[model samples]
Target: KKVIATKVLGTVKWFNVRNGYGFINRNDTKEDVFVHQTAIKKYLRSVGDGETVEFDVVEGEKGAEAANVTGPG
Candidate 1:
């Protein structure tokens, strides 16, 4: 009962475009995912506070990080 796509939906905790970093809370597990502006799937990606987003989880140097993030389409 666990087979699913790596891509999951989450809520943006906050992101500073200038600083180029942010955090996301996974809808499924509610895990705090670290995300950088570079991980965003856009020409100039940046997440807004409390915004809905989709992304994949990966083990970063620090901890769990959000990869291939997409904002509300």
Candidate 2:
């Protein structure tokens, strides 16, 4: 399948560095997208609340998840 880039508006609920996974709330859809620690290449320090992230959209078990996320560089 072809990969497409999509931006989702959401807050950084929480991220578990130990577990390597997190969740984001889509503003428009009010849906939670699972974000694996591996999916993020940058922002290793930590993600804050109400931080808008632009990420690649990928189909997952529940629904669309974020991948290859990066802050505005």
Candidate 3:
């Protein structure tokens, strides 16, 4: 059973505001998702490890790029 949503929830593996990127453990698949600082909300400085985040992904050359990411609420 595989039904991927346009918006998915995940755990923020790590995100460095200045360094500009990190990864997220996608909840359902455990896929390490690639998240760039540009993908997040302007209000959010950065997402740290273990934080729950919701996002959308797009297929990339080597991995999925995290987009439209934010907190659960």
Candidate 4:
């Protein structure tokens, strides 16, 4: 895979351990993007509150969504 686009860097606003979904505040744009559990690339497949991440943005039915979410490592 090539570098189709630069990953969006952000901080997790809140991820409900119950709902398995949350939002991320973009570092560059300062916009909140929706993140689902399946988008996480961590070992636990989930992100905690305030966790920093790099992800891709996609336009969804509801609004901007996070995709391929992963940590800064």
Q: Highest TM-score: which candidate?
A: 4
| Residue pairs in collision within model 1 | none
CA lDDT, every model vs. true structure: 0.81, 0.69, 0.80, 0.83
lDDT of 4 by residue, 11-46 (tens): 999998788899999999898888889878863888
Which is the winner by TM-score between candidate 3 and candidate 4? Answer: 4
As a whole number from 0 to 100, the lDDT of residue 52 in candidate 4 is 94
- Please provide TM-scores, in order, for all candidate models, with all chains considered together: 0.83, 0.70, 0.80, 0.84
Clashes of each: 0, 0, 0, 0
Q: Give the higher-TM-score candidate: 1 or 4.
A: 4
- Model 3 earns a TM-score of 0.80
lDDT (Cα) of model 2: 0.69
Query: Which 10-residue span in candidate 2 carries the lowest summed lDDT?
Result: 1-10
Rate residue 68 of model 1 by lDDT: 86
The RMSD of every model to the true structure, in order and in angstroms, is 4.1, 2.9, 4.0, 3.3
Q: Predictions ranked by TM-score, top down?
A: 4, 1, 3, 2
Off by over 4 Å in 3: 1-5, 43-45
Q: Cα miss at 69, model 3 (Å)?
A: 0.5
